[PDB]
């Protein structure tokens, strides 16, 4: 239809055709999950190793934001990287003025208005990424996910990309076992298994597991990449049970 040939025309659908297309692209990105715990969050991502000529843990998908907001995104890499960068600029203004780190829902709102304008206008191409973000601010731990639609809600689990289906199923155990969320150290191990079983859907290329956390009890409520021995151990747990 002509609504696909003119952005920002009210379809009789009620949502413009282009914006819908934009969503579809999220899926072509990698299985990315987030786990809400009892005193922090975990971010975990499958990073396909393209070739031997690719260089371990140097173009890491996990990106730091502020000093307490952990961020990863799925879909158009170029689009998302600009969006994460936009996000810091906004946070920056917030810190100067109010002399305080941004609440995570404040951060979601600000990003929300930015997306909204850029779909309501013809001139600016709709964004086509879904962003998992959050960490430990003043109101403690939160996990939010920002649809490219511009909806956002609070969550207790997030999963996106192709292998989300596998991922959601494994996340249901977490809630039943603990309404609290699993212990932040133990959830590092669960998280690896979730990424690894969901790499049986994305096995065609090799992958590297990258985990991060912002947790009050094991990170002092600042952001950090989980590296070294905790990371190598996590892979074993997963490998052992899928055998």
């Amino acid at each position: 239809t002509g609504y696909d040939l003119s952005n920002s025309v009210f379809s009789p659908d009620g949502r413009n055709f282009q914006v819908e297309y934009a969503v579809k692209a999220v899926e072509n990105g990698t299985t990315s999950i987030g786990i809400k715990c009892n005193d922090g969050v975990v971010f975990a991502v499958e990073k396909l190793i393209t070739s031997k000529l690719l260089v371990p843990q140097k173009n890491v998908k996990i990106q730091v934001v502020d000093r307490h907001i952990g961020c990863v995104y799925s879909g158009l890499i170029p689009d998302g990287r600009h969006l994460v960068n936009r996000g810091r600029e906004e946070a920056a203004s917030f810190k100067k003025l109010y002399k305080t780190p941004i609440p995570i829902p404040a951060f979601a709102d600000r990003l929300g208005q930015y997306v909204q304008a850029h779909t309501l206008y013809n001139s600016v191409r709709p964004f086509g990424v879904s962003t998992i973000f959050g960490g430990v601010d003043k109101n403690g731990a939160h996990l939010y996910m920002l649809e490219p639609s511009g909806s956002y809600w609070g969550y207790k689990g997030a999963a996106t990309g192709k292998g989300r289906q596998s991922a959601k199923a494994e996340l249901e155990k977490l809630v039943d076992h603990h309404p609290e969320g699993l212990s932040a150290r133990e959830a590092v191990k669960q998280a690896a298994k979730i990424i690894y079983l969901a790499h049986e859907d994305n096995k065609e290329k090799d992958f590297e597991l990258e985990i991060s956390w912002c947790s009050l009890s094991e990170t002092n409520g600042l952001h950090k990449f989980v590296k070294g021995d905790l990371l190598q151990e996590a892979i074993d747990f997963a490998q052992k049970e899928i055998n």
Binding site: D4, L5, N7, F17, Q18, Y21, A22, K24, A25, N122, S123, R125, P126, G128
Partner: peptide, 15 residues
């Protein structure tokens, strides 16, 4: 021309 003819316009798939 038509869709995918300018940067803003999406094909249905979005490539």
């Amino acid at each position: 021309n038509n869709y995918d003819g300018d940067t803003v316009t999406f094909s249905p798939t979005g490539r």
